[PDB]
Structures are given as C-alpha cells and as structure tokens.
Amino acid sequence: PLHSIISSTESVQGSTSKHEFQAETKKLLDIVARSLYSEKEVFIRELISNASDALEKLRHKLVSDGQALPEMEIHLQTNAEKGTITIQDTGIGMTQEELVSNLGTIARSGSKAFLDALAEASSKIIGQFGVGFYSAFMVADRVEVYSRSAAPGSLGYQWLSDGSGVFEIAEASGVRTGTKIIIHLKSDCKEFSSEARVRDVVTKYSNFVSFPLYLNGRRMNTLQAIWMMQHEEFYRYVAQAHDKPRYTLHYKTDAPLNIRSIFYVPDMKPSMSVALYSRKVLIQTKATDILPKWLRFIRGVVDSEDIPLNLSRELLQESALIRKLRDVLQQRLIKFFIDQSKKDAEKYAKFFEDYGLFMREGIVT
Amino acid sequence: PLHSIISSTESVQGSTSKHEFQAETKKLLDIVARSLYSEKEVFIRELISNASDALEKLRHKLVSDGQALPEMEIHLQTNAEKGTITIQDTGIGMTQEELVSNLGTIARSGSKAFLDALAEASSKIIGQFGVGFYSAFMVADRVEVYSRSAAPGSLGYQWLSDGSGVFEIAEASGVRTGTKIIIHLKSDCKEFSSEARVRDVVTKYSNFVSFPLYLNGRRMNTLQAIWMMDPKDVREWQHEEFYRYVAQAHDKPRYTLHYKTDAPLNIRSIFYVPDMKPSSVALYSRKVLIQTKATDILPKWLRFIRGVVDSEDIPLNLSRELLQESALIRKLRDVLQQRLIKFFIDQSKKDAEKYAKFFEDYGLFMREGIVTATEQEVKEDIAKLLRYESSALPSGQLTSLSEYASRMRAGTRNIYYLCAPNRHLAEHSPYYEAMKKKDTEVLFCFEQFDELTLLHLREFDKKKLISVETD
Ligand SMILES: Nc1ncnc2c1ncn2[C@@H]1O[C@H](COP(=O)(O)OP(=O)(O)NP(=O)(O)O)[C@@H](O)[C@H]1O
Ligand SMILES: Nc1ncnc2c1ncn2[C@@H]1O[C@H](COP(=O)(O)OP(=O)(O)NP(=O)(O)O)[C@@H](O)[C@H]1O
Numbered sequence A: 001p002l003h004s005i006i007s008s009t010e011s012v013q014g015s016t017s018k019h020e021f022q023a024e025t026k027k028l029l030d031i032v033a034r035s036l037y038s039e040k041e042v043f044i045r046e047l048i049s050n051a052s053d054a055l056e057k058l059r060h061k062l063v064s065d066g067q068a069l070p071e072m073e074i075h076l077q078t079n080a081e082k083g084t085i086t087i088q089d090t091g092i093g094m095t096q097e098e099l100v101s102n103l104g105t106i107a108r109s110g111s112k113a114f115l116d117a118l119a120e121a122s123s124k125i126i127g128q129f130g131v132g133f134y135s136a137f138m139v140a141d142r143v144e145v146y147s148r149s150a151a152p153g154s155l156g157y158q159w160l161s162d163g164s165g166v167f168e169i170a171e172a173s174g175v176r177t178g179t180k181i182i183i184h185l186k187s188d189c190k191e192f193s194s195e196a197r198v199r200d201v202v203t204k205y206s207n208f209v210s211f212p213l214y215l216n217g218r219r220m221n222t223l224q225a226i227w228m229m230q231h232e233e234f235y236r237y238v239a240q241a242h243d244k245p246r247y248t249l250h251y252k253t254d255a256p257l258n259i260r261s262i263f264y265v266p267d268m269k270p271s272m273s274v275a276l277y278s279r280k281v282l283i284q285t286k287a288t289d290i291l292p293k294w295l296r297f298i299r300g301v302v303d304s305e306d307i308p309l310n311l312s313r314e315l316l317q318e319s320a321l322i323r324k325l326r327d328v329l330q331q332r333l334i335k336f337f338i339d340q341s342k343k344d345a346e347k348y349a350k351f352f353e354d355y356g357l358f359m360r361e362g363i364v365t
Numbered sequence B: 001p002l003h004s005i006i007s008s009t010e011s012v013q014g015s016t017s018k019h020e021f022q023a024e025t026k027k028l029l030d031i032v033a034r035s036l037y038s039e040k041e042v043f044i045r046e047l048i049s050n051a052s053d054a055l056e057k058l059r060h061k062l063v064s065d066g067q068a069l070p071e072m073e074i075h076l077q078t079n080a081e082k083g084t085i086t087i088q089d090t091g092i093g094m095t096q097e098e099l100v101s102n103l104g105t106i107a108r109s110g111s112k113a114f115l116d117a118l119a120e121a122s123s124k125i126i127g128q129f130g131v132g133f134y135s136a137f138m139v140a141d142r143v144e145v146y147s148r149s150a151a152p153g154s155l156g157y158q159w160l161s162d163g164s165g166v167f168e169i170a171e172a173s174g175v176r177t178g179t180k181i182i183i184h185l186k187s188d189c190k191e192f193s194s195e196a197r198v199r200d201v202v203t204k205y206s207n208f209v210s211f212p213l214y215l216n217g218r219r220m221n222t223l224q225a226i227w228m229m230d231p232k233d234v235r236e237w238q239h240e241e242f243y244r245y246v247a248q249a250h251d252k253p254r255y256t257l258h259y260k261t262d263a264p265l266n267i268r269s270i271f272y273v274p275d276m277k278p279s280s281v282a283l284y285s286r287k288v289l290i291q292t293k294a295t296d297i298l299p300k301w302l303r304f305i306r307g308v309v310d311s312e313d314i315p316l317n318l319s320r321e322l323l324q325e326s327a328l329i330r331k332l333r334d335v336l337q338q339r340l341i342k343f344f345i346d347q348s349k350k351d352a353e354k355y356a357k358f359f360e361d362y363g364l365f366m367r368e369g370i371v372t373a374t375e376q377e378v379k380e381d382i383a384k385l386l387r388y389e390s391s392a393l394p395s396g397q398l399t400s401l402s403e404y405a406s407r408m409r410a411g412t413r414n415i416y417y418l419c420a421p422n423r424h425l426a427e428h429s430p431y432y433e434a435m436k437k438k439d440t441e442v443l444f445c446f447e448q449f450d451e452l453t454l455l456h457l458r459e460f461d462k463k464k465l466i467s468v469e470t471d
C-alpha cells in the first residue's frame, strides 16, 4: 500500500527570467512591532544600546584621531504629563544620508557596517541585525528624532515617522551633535511615561552600560561589570539576596569559546538560575539552559560575545554550541569544587551540604 | 545633583522630504536563515504547514464553485542518494504572478490575503507572517520549485533560487496542479535526506495536519485530533491511546477532562492525570505544534497535568516556537487554572476515594501551589483541594476545609490544625488535648509541607488558620 505522486514529470521550456527578492516593508515593520519581542519594555533596551553604539563609534574615531573626548552621556527623560519617552546621546549621530539609510532602510546596521572596517570597538558595538530601532513602534503612536553628525559641517535633522511605510525628514537646527529620540506613546503604553517604570526597565536590561546614564537627571550605573576583570554586593545583587557568597569563582576563558563568567554559592539552603549577558546587555534574566540542573543552586553571571543571538535578543541560538558550552561550565565547576576541597578542610560535602543533595540530584542524571 | 542635557532646543526651518521605508532583502533572508528558529528541522514543519494551506485554499474555492474535489494529499520524499528532501502538495498552486509575489516578496502572505478576503474555512489556514518558505534556506544550497495553478488555463512553472537575493522563473511542462518543492540539502544538512529523521520531524510538528500525508509512500497522520471532537464521541480507548501518545507514557489516565470554551478565547483542550505516582501540557495552534512543553499556559503547580491545549488565536511569535504574551495568556491561564481546580473539586464530589488517593499521590503540587500563589483568593481556590484528617473522625479518613467550616459554627471562631509526623503523636499531644476539652476541633496534618502551606494560606473562607502548637 505504497503511495507516491512525486515523479520526475517536468521539463523547463524557454529560458528563465531573473528576479530580485523584495519586501513588504510596512508589514515587516509591524511584524517587529507586535510579533518579535515578548514584552514591550525591551524597546528601551534597544534604544539604550543604540546610544551606546553611537557613543562608542564616536569615541573610536576620536581616539584614532588624537582628539579629546567630550562628555559622553546617555539621558532618559520621562514626561508623564505629555505622554512621552525621550532618549538622547552624545554619540556620533547621523547625517541626512545616514538618516534616510540607517533609520529608513530595514535590516540596515550602520553599526555592523562600521564594524566591517575595523580590533577594539568591535568588541563593544552591540547591534548586528538592523531592526532594533523599530522596537519603538511597539509602544509609539509616533517617533520624533533629531540628529546631528559629529563630523564638521553638519546640519541638524528631524527624522519623524508614524511607523508605516513613510518617514519624513526636515532640516532642524539647534540640535546638539548626537541624537535625541522622543517617542510619543500609545494609550496602552503611557506606563512608560513613569519614571519608576522606566527606572526598573533600565535596571533590568541596561544596568551595566559602558557610558554614564541619567534617568530624569539621576545617574544610574556606578555598578561595575565585574565579570570582565566586592563580589559581595554583586552576588547579593544578581542573585537578589540578603545573603553573601560562601563560594566564589571568577572564570574567564577563550579555550573553548570566549566565556566571561562568575559563579556564586550562597549561604542559605533552598527548601523550595544563572543570568546570561552579551556585551553588557541582558539576554535572559533567568538563563535556561546553560547550566546542568543539579547546579541550579549556583548563580551569578555568564557572558559570551560569541553566542549567536536570536533576532529577539532575548534568546540564545540553540545552535548546539550553547549546551556544549554548558558542558564546559560543568567541567570547570567540578574542577573548581574538587580543588577547593583540597585548599580547604571544609570540603566538597558536609561543608555546604545543603547542596550534597544537589549532587546525587547530580547522578539522578 | 540633578543633571539633564535634554531640553527642547530644536527648531524646524524647512518643510519635510517624504520617503518610503526600504529593506535589505538579502540580510533579511539571512536573518530568517541563521537567526530566527531555534532548530533547523522546523523548515519541514513550515513547508508542511504552508503546503497544508494550499489544499485548504483549493478546497475552499472548489467547494465555493460546487466542484468535486481532487485527491487532496501532502507528499514527502527523501532522496539520500541525490541528497534532497521533497514536499509536494495537490493544492491550489501558483500562477507565475503568484510565484513572483508570494515567494519573491518577503513577508508577503497570499494565505492571509486570502483570509483578508474571506467565515467557515478561516479557522484552518496556518500562515500569516509571510517569511516561512524562506526557512528552507536554513538547510538548502538550492531550492527547486514547480508549481501550476488550479486556475483553468494555467501554465506550469519552475521557480528556483539559492537564497541570495535573486531567483529565476521559467515555463515548465508536465507540472501537476499544485506545488512540488525539491530542496537540495547543504553538505552538513543531508541529515534531512533520512527517512527516519524526517519521519521524526513530521510526527513532531505536523502529526495532526488536516490532509493525508505520505512519507516515501507511507501514510503518516494516522492519529485523530481528539481535542477537536465532541467529548462523547471519544471514550476510554482513544483517550488512553492519545494520552499514551502526548504524555509519552505507557499507563492510563486517573483523570480525564475535555474542556472547550470561547470564554475568553477559543480553547479546545484535554487534560490527563496519569496513574503512576510522580517521580507541561502540549500547545497547538491550527493543528500545528507550538511547544512540546506548554510552559506558560498552565500555572506551574499544575505542571503534573499532561495532554493538549489548542487555540486558533494564540498570538504567535515570529518564530512560531514561542508564545507572544498579550493580556490574553494571563487570562487563558487563569481560565485553565480555575476550570482545572473546579474539575478536581467536583470530581472529588462524585468519587471521594479516588480523589483521596489523587491527594495522596499529587497533594504535593497543590501545597506548592498555595505557598507560591500571590493572590490569596487563588490560594483559597487551591485550598479547597486540600484534604486533611481530623480528630473527630476515625484514623485514616480525610476531610476538606469547607467540611470543617460546615462542621464548626455557632459560637466557634477559627479553623485550625496540628502538624506532627504520625497520628498517634497528634492524638497524644499536650496541645491538642488542651484543644480538646475546651474542644473546638483541630485538623491533623502529617505531611508537614502542610504547615508551611497552612502558614502561607493564613486564611480560608472568611477565617484565619491559627496554630494549636502555637497557643
Ligand atoms: N542614536 C543613534 N545615533 C546614531 N546612529 C544611530 C542611532 N540609532 C540608530 N543609529 C543608526 O541606525 C541603525 C539602526 O539601529 P538598529 O535598528 O538598532 O539596528 P542595529 O543597532 O544596527 N542592530 P540591532 O539593534 O541588533 O537591530 C544603527 O545600526 C546605526 O547605524
Ligand atoms: N505549497 C505552496 N503551494 C502554493 N503556494 C504556496 C505554497 N507555499 C507557499 N505558497 C505561497 O507563498 C506565500 C508565502 O508563504 P510563506 O512564506 O510560507 O509564509 P505564509 O504561508 O504566507 N505565512 P507563514 O507560514 O506564517 O510564513 C503563501 O502565502 C502562498 O501564496
């Protein structure tokens, strides 16, 4: 009772016609606006990252040109009263051509475009896809942008758009070199006019940006990205704990893949995990799965620039390198513990044995 | 000190230049290829899904012309020797114009155009985003397509491309109405020229496709979508085999609930509780698999339940591998939480002993459910499932909190319990004999994850839960 209808029944007649793939751009834009990210909030994340890059770029050229570095800041003002968000940066900024192209062309990344020339600033430039800015439209009735290029005879420009097929660009002056982005919020999104809300978002995704950051005049950071160089406040921060670390491991490596990671073991038991970053932007607040589940008591921070990220940037690409990275971490963690039950008496077992149950939890598997 | 650089300094001099958004089509195709899906295998799913659409559309228009229908099938052929995987449908197929537009334009969906022109057959069309076909480029050096429209004076065409910004279209003779897609696998992807591998993929995602599917000659979709049938036209042998499929188990369900609602959104679902003692329901949309693990659509305390939940309108992520949450998955999951809680309380009300060992085998999850829940009405909801033992009824028997709210009244004011590892310690306790001869009644809990549960519940049915080993 076999049944197939697949047979070699075709014959191509008359020479082909050659064509070029094209795009339903408005539908692409809204696909990003309502079918790409899990939470609306990440739009902030995206914008911040843009700013970072803008700044990074600037200083790169500046550094490579023996010129002093102006104050390089990122500002977030929340206007509750007028229903808006604004993010502004002292970065390199756009010209009109750069406007039209980088903002108006979908999937264009003048950042990765910048990258394909450089390798220091290559390690901190964050964007790669060319779709992130459009996250604004998740929450925006309308987007207002003013920008001006660091380069000499630059005019200011007003690039604005409603989020649908057409953007428009007028010449605007009185724009500070860099870029300001005013977002006028949708009704169901006025919650981002809240300083407290925006604060929580930034603390969530961009708590560790390489440039000073001022929400409504208050500075944010001053929390150093320790996993790349008082593990105490860092443990009790990332693990969220009024507790302090029994055990600590700072683990950098570039054999296997580039990994910059720190692991804590906390002082209470659980009764009843980690967190993954890339280029100082949060990928998953609770990071699953890049740590064997018997090791769920451990937590802290794993970073790797060389993780392929999903288009959403909230996901690892389970291109199998990732849970083989998992395996690498299991290896160095084991070696960590056996070594630290030979550097002290303590040890591997009755020491922290609210966790011995995690290791024949361990050979459950 | 407060520092802000942001102030309204700008002023617009001119008048605007108008522009249209454009796109980098090649980088986009590549974004679909290397950065969208969690695993490559899903290209099969997509093809099949989009293939499915072709048939449905054809059906819809043949029926709307009063035509009889052709044989409406889906065929997959793996050729290991030429390293290709092929999918052919006998659906509507494409004209030349339809080839250029529907394959050549990114995010173009002739399927949802077809839908935005359409009632009845609208529940079935899978596609909406218009990027799915391109998933083939995850695994293809090159893609051969032949298609001929079911339109009357149709010609046949060969649309072919390597996934790099350019495709070509030729006229072709000998094309059967519908579409053949021959995928020429890449070197590290001839993995998908295996009959076993592909069979696995097909059963994983596309096991309930509403058209007969033949792989290398064999019929595949042989299992009926039981959650869309009327609850009486399914009874124990199909429920057993369906459970023993979705829950990968080799026992029987203790409990079976067939739940259908359009209160909020369309739910067509089955929930099973297994008969083994424990040592994630499956999510579908339009008969296509979304998550093996449907987390989150059920609260995590109901993770012990297995089975299937389907909904036509679950907002899908661009990947179709994830759920995009709107207001509606919160509400979906509170719908399912309460329908399940009610299920367990009333099926306790119809058979008390089977519920008794349901509690002795699964009470653990309800305890957890009560300690974790934020809203306390919810805590009380789960609390109606808790059965403890009591002093006033013989050793062994259990009782609900509500039965104790009924059995204590008049001038009695609170509920409470005593926790201890055995009954004889509970029944021989200083604290309870003190509770016994001013005697108001005291519950007995011997699974002291029960006193944690009771401490977090704190109050049930307009009353507090007070301790006796704390008076
Ligand atoms: N604030 C800004 N200042 C200067 N240039 C910017 C700014 N925001 C965006 N751009 C430019 O416009 C592009 C659009 O940004 P975006 O949509 O975020 O894509 P991307 O940052 O390049 N990569 P991704 O964010 O992952 O999609 C950037 O790549 C820059 O070239
Ligand atoms: N097997 C097929 N037979 C005929 N037409 C097809 C077939 N597959 C795709 N098409 C056409 O190509 C278009 C693009 O489909 P596709 O890129 O797979 O995404 P979509 O089906 O439109 N929606 P989605 O599944 O979410 O991506 C469809 O709308 C059809 O017009």
Ligand SMILES: [Mg+2]
Binding pocket: A046, A049, A050, A126, A127, A128, A132, A133
């Ligand atoms: Mg960006």
Ligand SMILES: [Mg+2]
Binding pocket: B046, B050, B127, B128, B130, B131, B132, B133
């Ligand atoms: Mg499709």
